[PDB]
Write a protein that binds this ligand. Structure first.
Ligand SMILES: *[C@@H]1O[C@H](CO)[C@@H](O[C@@H]2O[C@H](CO)[C@@H](O[C@@H]3O[C@H](CO)[C@@H](O)[C@H](O)[C@@H]3O)[C@H](O)[C@H]2NC(C)=O)[C@H](O)[C@H]1NC(C)=O
Ligand SMILES: *[C@@H]1O[C@H](CO)[C@@H](O[C@@H]2O[C@H](CO)[C@@H](O)[C@H](O)[C@H]2NC(C)=O)[C@H](O)[C@H]1NC(C)=O
Ligand SMILES: *C/C=C(C)/C=C\C=C(C)\C=C\C1=C(C)CCCC1(C)C
Ligand SMILES: CCCCCCCS[C@@H]1O[C@H](CO)[C@@H](O)[C@H](O)[C@H]1O
Ligand SMILES: CCCCCCCS[C@@H]1O[C@H](CO)[C@@H](O)[C@H](O)[C@H]1O
Ligand SMILES: *C(=O)CCCCCCCCCCCCCCC
Ligand SMILES: *C(=O)CCCCCCCCCCCCCCC
Ligand SMILES: C=CC/C=C/C=C/CCCCCCCCC
Ligand SMILES: CC(=O)/C=C/C1=C(C)CCCC1(C)C
Ligand SMILES: [Hg+2]
Ligand SMILES: [Hg+2]
Ligand SMILES: [Hg+2]
Ligand SMILES: [Zn+2]
Ligand SMILES: [Zn+2]
Ligand SMILES: [Zn+2]
Ligand SMILES: [Zn+2]
Length: 348
């Protein structure tokens, strides 16, 4: 056999030398150099140190500034929240695991590690669908006099969680299961064994279709619409009203957010589809380790795109960090928001 199947795991190493141990009972240093596990640990340490403050700050500024209530401001607030669950929900265990070379917390630690990475990745995938919809409704404007309200945005947010939970929770209650991957310091969906006893195969097809292919189809089809209507081409203020030039900034960001999502999950998705379609083939530990741990960056890149591609939010963050206020130079050069500085309402 090319690997060592356990009743609870599947180590990507031969046990012909009888040196393979359950990833829930002993270190896996026989799979790789011990310094490489330290690498993983240092890496997770740094991700947590980056992920916590970046997402918390994003969360804090959105709340402290009353006028930050567009659908985009909601989705990113929702993302930072999801990202914080990733950091404290799963990254804390993946760091603890990497430090010991195996899941000392047994299957529970594996469920935490896998559930939160999945939840987070999916909340983002579905958040992209919503954003793609919202972006469609404002650019191609399917209605005549319509505008999304805080109510609709909260609906979208509630939606992403329902969809994400529909993908990450089944494995905690009998449909498929979370299992250690690569160097066995991270956990994911069981693509390794057929374990009919928990219907692993049907869940995988369900995950790749309902929670990967379909959403991407929607997203790319919707984009194909904003091919003619709007475009990445943006000049100075106006074009068709300054409300058009500013509307373009948000769309440019949403498109980048998709590029990033793909760059972060296509390799993990790719190696997972392979394994699933080559169960028992001869692949080693590093195979899934690299894409799996790289995908964990999904917990901090969104807020970075937000702050770097949204003049308004960035100015609000500066105003928050510089205490009282003092946005210096630009300030925004457009409408702004906060809790007492200049959140003055400006309708009619
Ligand atoms: C890879 O092959 C080796 C050798 O066949 C497997 O080692 C065996 O592992 C089991 C469980 O870890 C050992 O059983 C132990 O028996 C004592 C009874 O004295 C019990 O108190 C312990 O709780 C445990 O059940 C067994 O002795 C050991 N045999 C060896 C080293 O020759 C190893 O499990 C295989 N890797 C897999 C399939 O994960
Ligand atoms: C162990 O892994 C090897 C290589 O991944 C598997 O051998 C391949 O099997 C497929 C389908 O049977 C063939 O198309 C390839 O040509 C084989 N490659 C080799 C080794 O030349 C092998 O089947 C696996 N053993 C199992 C299933 O336990
Ligand atoms: C480090 C931990 C990881 C990567 C844990 C598990 C993650 C998954 C099973 C993620 C699945 C998928 C997502 C989030 C994005 C679209 C493709 C997908 C279905 C492979
Ligand atoms: C970017 C998505 C990644 C696509 C997945 C490529 C699987 S490729 C696969 O990998 C095995 C293990 O290293 C090799 O032994 C085998 O020769 C190779 O063809
Ligand atoms: C860190 C993610 C950002 C890097 C990806 C390239 C985004 S693109 C970049 O966005 C700026 C603000 O929206 C625009 O002013 C600029 O013209 C445009 O090229
Ligand atoms: C205004 O006074 C000048 C800008 C100074 C901002 C310095 C940037 C440091 C960012 C640290 C924020 C940490 C977030 C807190 C998480 C608890
Ligand atoms: C409100 O306006 C406070 C600003 C918060 C930004 C944090 C700025 C940190 C101050 C610089 C510290 C200098 C480093 C010296 C270390 C000995
Ligand atoms: C088109 C791409 C937009 C890309 C954006 C990226 C923003 C990224 C943050 C990634 C943080 C990784 C940290 C590793 C610390 C060892
Ligand atoms: C795919 C990848 O980046 C590395 C693949 C591998 C190498 C180089 C060494 C042993 C086996 C494994 C883990 C398959
Ligand atoms: Hg779109
Ligand atoms: Hg990424
Ligand atoms: Hg602002
Ligand atoms: Zn079983
Ligand atoms: Zn989902
Ligand atoms: Zn199969
Ligand atoms: Zn500026």
């Amino acid at each position: 056999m090319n690997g060592t199947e356990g009743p609870n795991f599947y180590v990507p190493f031969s046990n012909k030398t009888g040196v393979v141990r359950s990833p829930f009972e002993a270190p896996q240093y026989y799979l790789a150099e011990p310094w490489q596990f330290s690498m993983l640990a240092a890496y997770m340490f740094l991700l947590i140190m980056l992920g916590f403050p970046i997402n918390f700050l994003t969360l804090y500024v959105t709340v402290q500034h009353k006028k930050l209530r567009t659908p985009l401001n909601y989705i990113l607030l929702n993302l930072a929240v999801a990202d914080l669950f990733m950091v404290f929900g799963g990254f804390t265990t993946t760091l603890y695991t990497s430090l010991h070379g195996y899941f000392v917390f047994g299957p529970t630690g594996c469920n935490l590690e896998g559930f939160f990475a999945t939840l987070g990745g999916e909340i983002a995938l579905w958040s992209l669908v919503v954003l793609a919809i919202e972006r469609y409704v404002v650019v191609c404007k399917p209605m005549s006099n319509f505008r999304f309200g805080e109510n609709h945005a909260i609906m979208g947010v509630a939606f992403t969680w329902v969809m994400a939970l529909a993908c990450a929770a089944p494995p905690l209650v009998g449909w498929s299961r979370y299992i250690p991957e690569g160097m066995q310091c991270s956990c994911g969906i069981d693509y390794y064994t057929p374990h009919e006893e928990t219907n692993n195969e049907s869940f995988v097809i369900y995950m790749f279709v309902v929670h990967f292919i379909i959403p991407l189809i929607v997203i790319f089809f919707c984009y194909g619409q904003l091919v003619f209507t709007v475009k990445e081409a943006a000049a100075q203020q106006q074009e068709s009203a300054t409300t058009q030039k500013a509307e373009k900034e948000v769309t440019r960001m949403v498109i980048i957010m998709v590029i990033a999502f793909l760059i972060c999950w296509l390799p993990y998705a790719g190696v997972a589809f392979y394994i699933f379609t080559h169960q028992g083939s001869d692949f080693g530990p590093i195979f899934m380790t690299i894409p799996a741990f790289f995908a964990k960056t999904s917990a901090v890149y969104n807020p970075v795109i937000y702050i770097m591609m949204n003049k308004q939010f960035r100015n609000c963050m500066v105003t928050t960090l510089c205490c009282g206020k003092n946005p210096l130079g630009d300030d925004e050069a457009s409408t702004t928001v906060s809790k007492t500085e200049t959140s003055q309402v400006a309708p009619a």
